[PDB]
Design a protein around this ligand. Sequence first.
Ligand code: 5H6
Ligand code: MG
Length: 714
Amino acid sequence: TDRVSVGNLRIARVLYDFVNNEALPGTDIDPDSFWAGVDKVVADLTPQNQALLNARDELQAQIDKWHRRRVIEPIDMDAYRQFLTEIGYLLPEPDDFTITTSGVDAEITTTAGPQLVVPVLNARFALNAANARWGSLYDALYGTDVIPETDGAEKGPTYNKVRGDKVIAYARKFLDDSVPLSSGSFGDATGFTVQDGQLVVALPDKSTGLANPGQFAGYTGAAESPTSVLLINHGLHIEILIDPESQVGTTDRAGVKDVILESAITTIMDFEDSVAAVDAADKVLGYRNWLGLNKGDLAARVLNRDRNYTAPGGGQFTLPGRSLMFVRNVGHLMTNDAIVDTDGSEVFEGIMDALFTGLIAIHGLKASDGPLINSRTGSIYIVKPKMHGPAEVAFTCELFSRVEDVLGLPQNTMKIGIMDEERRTTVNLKACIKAAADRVVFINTGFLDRTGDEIHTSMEAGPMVRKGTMKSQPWILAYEDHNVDAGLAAGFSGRAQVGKGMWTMTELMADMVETKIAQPRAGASTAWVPSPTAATLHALHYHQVDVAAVQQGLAGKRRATIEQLLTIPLAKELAWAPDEIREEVDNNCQSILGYVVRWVDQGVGASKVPDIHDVALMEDRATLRISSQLLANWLRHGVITSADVRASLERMAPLVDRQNAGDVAYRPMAPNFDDSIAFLAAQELILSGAQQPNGYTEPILHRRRREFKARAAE
Ligand SMILES: O=C(O)c1cc(-c2ccc(Cl)s2)on1
Ligand SMILES: [Mg+2]
């Protein structure tokens, strides 16, 4: 074949060449000893990796049997919880502690703000995310529905002045609320001056300074009529751009051209649920973009330089122009044929990701060719998804230690962002944080994956409530609060991020601005957004809410009990009219088909996907886990029949077809269903759902995408 032998490993040539030619030079790692390290790490850690995956299985089987041997009305929580304890699912909670993680950048320890997640296989997206640290508020307001397209203020082929004026008024209001003047409002401002280290704002009748002079952070141009004024509020920068000669500036009372907000403070470059990578060629493409980002030479459009300002006093300084990058590795489950052993057995992809994304990240710790791209404090930031419990966390930390040795990095260089998205992590969260107490830089919650796990875990208990209902169930509200509580009690405030989930409705920005404010109000120092535009709008929330104060107020509170966490989301007796059952089935089948068809046919793992009511959603692969699990649960307990499932898939497929009309490379699923690899993938996810380990959709998706790629190669 086309593989390179390195001890017991057989490495795909594309990967071997990529690493030797592009990734290794400049790192001062001996190529030969790097590869020997790969072979030794893979050999040493593979059995523990497999042991952990079998443990998930054995635990799940015991819970399955517990439910099946019982026939009682409601679950006896006391009994249930004692059972989870005996079998090792629920572990004892350790004593209080404070995390000791060190060498972490300010963006993570201190600054509260939006966090972008983007598919690393899409160079354009990744570049846009990296540059999304600063974004135009005017663009974000004019371009979306945050300013209503009421009569007269609608978006046309060209500039609407009525609408522009609403934009301007909106941002004036933001400035008054965020950086208030001593007297009067920015709405009446006439000009900006810097007089002896102090900001002077001219009003029609008088002039005034800031109510808090310290929020003045700097300017550009001459103090006597600056080209911009830089402000700071809750650690986030705001920049007023001054230019009376611009399209918008000409019509403005102070000649203001735009307001620029520091938005995406950090970004997660994603190798997991937002991308489709099923072989060596797909992995190399992702690795190559990750390398381009870290070397700062990725182009598809390039990376921004830092921003230059004059201090208020008159000196000079500089602010980062790029979002600080994390990478999200895949989790413990999947293998990938980018490397096989002599037996033909695929190597664990999570193990490979640590080695290769870790190797590659070394470049971000040094000079691009300009200044060094990423971490100035010398850290590598890796998000590790889908872990179940503190043993799996300890394993990931040991994998990182071993990689650090192979790479010649100081111990604890590789920091860990722990996703709390699996039930066995949730109920043992404190122990999970403790297992990573010297590497952890965040914890984070989310709707989709965690709900998918909830469904699979109690699959045998009975029929679950509908998908839309899940978002307001006691278990999940408790899960959200417990996560914040565990983080703050572990000393995250001032040290590590406490993060919340993605806003998926990309076009519903008015709704996001209205509702997402709940997350920083709950003490989240960060939350996920789908686009640079959403990052700029969500940044508004951090100007309104003092997250640090919120966190300080929550300290010491125990707002969720183990009993609440363990409250299974079972439907009541006879909860749904027949029409309601049908809507939910259609809803879920459309969700699966819509996402699956792009994934299997085009290898796209994230995009704006129209839902059943044509609302544009940007969800990752976890949308598949939840939908397939709910349908599998409804089929399992006799809520619906296999003909209902079939009929819905067939009803939804043409709909998904016409929803993809704009796409030149799209191939329809209807009417030849059993010919469409994608349609068959969607069906398999449902009918085999209950048998997939923890409801994970990767084994099936990966197989079907590989099958599609093979067909197309003929
Ligand atoms: O719903 C989620 O959890 C989620 C959505 C995404 C996205 C990846 C790329 C985008 Cl662009 S949005 O990542 N996680
Ligand atoms: Mg997830």
